[PDB]
Write a protein that binds this ligand. Sequence first.
Ligand SMILES: NC(=O)[C@H]1CCCN(C(=O)[C@@H]2CCSC2)C1
Ligand SMILES: [Zn+2]
Length: 140
Amino acid sequence: SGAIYVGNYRVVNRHLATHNDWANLVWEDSSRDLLVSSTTAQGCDTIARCDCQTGVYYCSSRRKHYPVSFSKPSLIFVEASEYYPARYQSHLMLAVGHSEPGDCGGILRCQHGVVGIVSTGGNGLVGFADVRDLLWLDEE
Ligand SMILES: NC(=O)[C@H]1CCCN(C(=O)[C@@H]2CCSC2)C1
Ligand SMILES: [Zn+2]
């Protein structure tokens, strides 16, 4: 579990969104595994606006932050699960690292701010949903 809290927005994995998220919806995209809902309180996270390919992510199944090298946001095949049929998830970045069920929502960050959230794992790989292109998260 986990979210990004920037301005009056809450960014979560679409497959983990709550009823309150859907009832206060700003934007969602199944192909990216992202959903954004509105918040009453202002958040403290800042979004990175950069092309970093190195950063640090939080792994809840290890209670640890790990430094990783990750690929550029791309269209990657994701195996069928209880949450989506086999498909291609867009704007996904892969790294070598531990990710298992319970880990979606952990933040990936760089020197500039939050880069994205854990969206996949298994096989010694971790996949992150990028948010750096969502410029509207920084305003209104
Ligand atoms: N982004 C996806 O399609 C996710 C949905 C949940 C299932 N996915 C996973 O990778 C599992 C949970 C973390 S380790 C294995 C794919
Ligand atoms: Zn950066």
